Amino acid sequence: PAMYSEEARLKSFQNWPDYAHLTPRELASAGLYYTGIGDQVQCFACGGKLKNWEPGDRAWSEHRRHFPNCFFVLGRN
Amino acid sequence: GTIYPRNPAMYSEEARLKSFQNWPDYAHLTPRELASAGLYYTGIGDQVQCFACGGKLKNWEPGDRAWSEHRRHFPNCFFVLGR
Ligand SMILES: [Zn+2]
Ligand SMILES: [Zn+2]
């Protein structure tokens, strides 16, 4: 329940690496929080994990691409 | 990509189906059902593994379905969530 809050997902992004190609805000808004390693993030609703973000990737697009049956993704759509 | 299968070669359902060549005769689930749910035989007992999430399942019981057990134990699997 700690990660339901978009604000609490932001706070997980302490130690988010400076190289990473997306921001804590964008990720948190798409339901994702930092797992604490690399540039890996996880969804608070489906638990799906995403990493190795590339320049130009968007948080929502990848989240919906790989975890289409996530309830949060299904509502966003 | 932003996701990555635990076992790329078992990416293929056909490759997964072939892994059941020596599936034991006591194991009641069919290779067809298991492979369709992303699972391939590890070669040990009745233990299968998902090519996507890498989760393992074994000690199957009557009325167990492959997809149901896969989703129950590994609900955040991209194969489960892409189905
Ligand atoms: Zn999700
Ligand atoms: Zn899986």
Numbering used by the authors:
A (entry chain C): 158 to 234
B (entry chain A): 151 to 233
What do the authors of the reporting publication say about this deposited model?
XIAP (X-linked inhibitor of apoptosis) directly inhibits the upstream caspase-9 and the downstream caspase-3 and caspase-7, and therefore controls critical apoptotic checkpoints. The XIAP protein consists of several domains, including three zinc-containing BIR (baculovirus IAP repeat) domains (BIR1, BIR2 and BIR3) and a C-terminal RING domain. As has been reported previously for other BIR domains, the overall architecture of the BIR2 domain is a three-stranded antiparallel β-sheet surrounded by five α-helices, with a structurally important zinc residue coordinated by Cys200, Cys203, His220 and Cys227.
XIAP BIR2(152–236;C202A,C213G) crystallizes as a dimer, with the N-­terminus of molecule A occupying the Smac binding site of molecule B. However, this binding does not mimic the binding mode observed in the Smac, caspase or peptide complexes; rather, it is likely to be the key to driving the crystallization of the protein. On the other hand, the rest of the protein, including the peptide-binding site, of caspase-3-bound XIAP BIR2 and our apo structure is very similar. Furthermore, these crystals diffract to better than 1.5 Å resolution.
